[PDB]
Specification:
This protein has two domains: about 90 residues, 2-Layer Sandwich (Phosphorylase Kinase, domain 1), CATH 3.30.200; about 180 residues, Transferase(Phosphotransferase), domain 1 (Orthogonal Bundle). About 35% of the residues lie in helices and about 15% in strands. α3 packs antiparallel against α8 and α5 packs antiparallel against α7. The longest helix is centred in the middle third of the chain and has 20 residues. It is globular and about 60 Å long. It starts with 6 loop residues before the first strand and ends in a 12-residue tail after the last helix. The chain binds phosphoaminophosphonic acid-adenylate ester and magnesium ion. Magnesium ion (MG) binds next to loops. It is found in: Cell membrane; Endoplasmic reticulum membrane; Golgi apparatus membrane; Nucleus membrane. Belongs to the protein kinase superfamily. Tyr protein kinase family. EGF receptor subfamily.
């Protein structure tokens, strides 16, 4: 494990400026990094974990989080260990994908929806290749770097209030977490995207979820989803973990759909919605996204 990928910060080097939100593991702040001797203030994201393990143990798993290198996975950049644990990552002005699809509920075309599914599956496939299990995949944990480029965040924060409605049944009943339970959570994530950010099992108590799942009930077909798309989601929620799709296969299936998007999603006014022109993509990347990344899938 290359320790050069993780910078240890002193509390004087940075400052938390504004709360962006919180979850089961901590509170996220927009912050500023001031490099020693410089007068510039560089925006960063800072997550202060709630618990506040020995430092060496934490630091050991931080190195792993800092070692991920994939265009669709957020890398841990720095850490500050004191009376609390603070994690430094790149700040994402657009915020999480869950908020984004809610705010653009009437502006989002099939090409974006299907490409996001592809990118999320690419990020998860990379984690599986690293033999790393996420355990907390959800639309709230996908960040928008640009509308054309999303990234998975917060994998393995357990190491270092359980999300029952995203969890595989075997995780609920037995706290077993695997790549195939990550696939279940991927299914729920895709459902959140396709419903433009609806809450899964709305109005149903968390305590009743396992019995509902055992009865064979699942999240309902989203109004924009054709049966082929919905069957993929349903396959992610099969009781037998090994009969669920693999992330490798999901990349291929959603990439195929992205090439003929109106055949797979039905969205009012979809023809009036395209992926950005080369001109607009070039501008976005120049200003916000210089990193390398696979081409988005365009319609045939
Ligand atoms: N790097 C970031 N840049 C900008 N906003 C961020 C960043 N990381 C997190 N956020 C936002 O901060 C919110 C709170 O994050 P977080 O503490 O990870 O809780 P959560 O992901 O929503 N739920 P949980 O699954 O329990 O961690 C997220 O939902 C995002 O909206
Ligand atoms: Mg999160």
């Amino acid at each position: 494990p290359n320790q050069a990928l993780l910078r240890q910060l002193k509390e004087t080097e940075f400052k938390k400026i504004k709360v962006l939100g919180s979850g089961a593991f901590g509170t996220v702040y927009k912050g500023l990094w001031i490099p020693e001797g410089e007068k510039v203030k560089i925006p960063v994201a800072i997550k202060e974990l709630r618990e506040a393990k020995a430092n060496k143990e934490i630091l050991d798993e931080a190195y792993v989080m800092a070692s991920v290198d994939n265009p669709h996975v957020c890398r841990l950049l720095g850490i500050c260990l004191t009376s609390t644990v603070q994690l430094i990552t790149q700040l994402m002005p657009f915020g999480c994908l869950l908020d984004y699809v809610r705010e653009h509920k009437d502006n989002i075309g099939s090409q974006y929806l299907l490409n996001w599914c592809v990118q999320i599956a690419k990020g998860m496939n990379y984690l599986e290749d690293r033999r790393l299990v996420h355990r907390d995949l959800a639309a709230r944990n996908v960040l928008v770097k640009t509308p054309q480029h999303v990234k998975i965040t917060d994998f393995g924060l357990a190491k270092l209030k359980v999300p029952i409605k995203w969890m595989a049944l075997e995780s609920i009943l037995h706290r077993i977490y695997t790549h195939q339970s990550d696939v279940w959570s991927y299914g729920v994530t895709v459902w959140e995207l396709m419903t433009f950010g609806s809450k899964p099992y709305d109005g149903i108590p968390a305590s009743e979820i396992s019995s509902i799942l055992e009865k064979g009930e699942r999240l309902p077909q989203p109004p924009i989803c054709t049966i082929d798309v919905y069957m993929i989601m349903v396959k992610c929620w099969m009781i037998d973990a090994d009969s669920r799709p693999k992330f490798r296969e999901l990349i291929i299936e959603f990439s195929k759909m992205a090439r003929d998007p109106q055949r797979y999603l039905v969205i009012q006014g979809d023809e009036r919605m395209h992926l950005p022109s080369p001109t607009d993509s070039n501008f976005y990347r120049a200003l916000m996204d210089e990193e390398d990344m696979d081409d988005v899938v365009d319609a045939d």
